[PDB]
Design a protein around this ligand. Sequence first.
Ligand SMILES: Nc1ncnc2c1ncn2[C@@H]1O[C@H](COP(=O)(O)OP(=O)(O)O)[C@@H](O)[C@H]1O
Ligand SMILES: Nc1ncnc2c1ncn2[C@@H]1O[C@H](COP(=O)(O)OP(=O)(O)O)[C@@H](O)[C@H]1O
Ligand SMILES: [Co+2]
Length: 203
Amino acid sequence: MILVFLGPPGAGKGTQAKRLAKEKGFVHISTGDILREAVQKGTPLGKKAKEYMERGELVPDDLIIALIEEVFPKHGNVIFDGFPRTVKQAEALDEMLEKKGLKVDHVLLFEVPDEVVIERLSGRRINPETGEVYHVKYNPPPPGVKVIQREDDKPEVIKKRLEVYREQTAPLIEYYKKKGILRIIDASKPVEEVYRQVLEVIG
Ligand SMILES: Nc1ncnc2c1ncn2[C@@H]1O[C@H](COP(=O)(O)OP(=O)(O)O)[C@@H](O)[C@H]1O
Ligand SMILES: Nc1ncnc2c1ncn2[C@@H]1O[C@H](COP(=O)(O)OP(=O)(O)O)[C@@H](O)[C@H]1O
Ligand SMILES: [Co+2]
């Protein structure tokens, strides 16, 4: 089965997806994670993407659409996490799945207010050795463990990513609600609670 996790940055989409992949064996496709690997490796995608990312802008559709083609697994259930981000991306995803006799089964919309997303992101910390994600207030790193804060988690960039989310990504809500596959999630709640609600949604 094929899920899309949709919603603003910091809503908790990655936290839930990684949890789901791990416990239920979903294939977790994180375009954010994939892109950062590429940038850090200086691949051609990496080198081109870098500037858009640093600046809180969207990497161009064609690049991302091709990236998805590359990583989409022949078998397994799939969580799309951070893709699609635009209407053009969603149209292309539909056609790709189609050629494979597949489709998007559920779009989960992680609803959470602007106020909450700023607190989630500004406090997001990463363990660079394992890539485990933490938060200063809600799930603090173990003492003596070194962690970084991502550049795009800075206030100015956060502001721009929110803006980008509202302009380009938010119209996906109506796009999927149209298909009758959009389920709403209350992403404001604690992790365990948001998680139980994700499980109930997907049966
Ligand atoms: N589907 C996509 N289409 C275009 N660009 C993307 C996509 N996914 C990620 N990116 C780029 O990578 C950056 C980091 O993505 P992501 O980790 O999903 O952001 P967030 O901090 O909101 O989780 C995005 O701001 C964007 O520049
Ligand atoms: N339900 C929640 N309540 C409180 N904090 C959360 C919750 N879900 C995630 N977080 C924290 O908020 C930050 C954003 O989570 P993340 O999954 O990285 O966001 P997204 O993937 O939607 O961009 C992370 O630091 C994470 O540890
Ligand atoms: Co993420």
